[PDB]
Amino acid sequence: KVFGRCELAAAMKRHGLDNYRGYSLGNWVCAAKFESNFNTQATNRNTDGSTDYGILQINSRWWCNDGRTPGSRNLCNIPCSALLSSDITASVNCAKKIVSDGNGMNAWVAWRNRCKGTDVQAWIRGCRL
Numbered sequence: 001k002v003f004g005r006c007e008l009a010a011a012m013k014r015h016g017l018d019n020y021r022g023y024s025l026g027n028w029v030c031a032a033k034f035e036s037n038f039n040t041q042a043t044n045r046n047t048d049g050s051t052d053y054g055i056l057q058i059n060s061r062w063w064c065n066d067g068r069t070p071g072s073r074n075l076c077n078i079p080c081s082a083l084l085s086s087d088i089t090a091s092v093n094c095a096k097k098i099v100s101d102g103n104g105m106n107a108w109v110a111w112r113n114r115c116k117g118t119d120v121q122a123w124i125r126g127c128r129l
């Protein structure tokens with residue numbers, strides 16, 4: 001599923017990401033934009049041989065199981081394919097764990113490089129919430 005900007009903001013809010021670990025909704029929407037372009041089906045191979053899955057590009061080395069990533073820990077206890085669903089519950093649940101790991105949203109390098117410190121409120125501008 002390719003979400004609209006405000007549609008995803010609404011879905012993230014409904015699943016409790018708004019201000020989760022202190023990160024406003026716009027931070028999460030901005031992260032999703034640059035990680036997946038709001039596309040739940042996004043997958044991208046990493047240089048270490050792991051793969052990133054879903055709207056928040058969650059990796060198969062630490063977080064989900066894809067069956068092809070040596071060293072897999074599957075800390076979210078989910079198949080990586082569940083992170084591709086039109087329902088974002090699995091991605092959200094796992095992102096809550098990731099952002100709690102100690103470095104906050106810096107765990108998403110695209111967030112650090114492209115969202116951190118910017119006017120992230122712009123991402124939810126005009127949305128009914």
Ligand SMILES: [Cl-]
Pocket residue numbers: 005033
């Ligand atoms: Cl957009």
Ligand SMILES: [Cl-]
Pocket residue numbers: 024025026027120121122124
């Ligand atoms: Cl915001």
Ligand SMILES: [Cl-]
Pocket residue numbers: 021022103104105
């Ligand atoms: Cl933090």
Ligand SMILES: [Yb+3]
Pocket residue numbers: 044046052057
């Ligand atoms: Yb990546």
Ligand SMILES: [Yb+3]
Pocket residue numbers: 101102
């Ligand atoms: Yb860690």
Ligand SMILES: [Yb+3]
Pocket residue numbers: 129
């Ligand atoms: Yb409201």
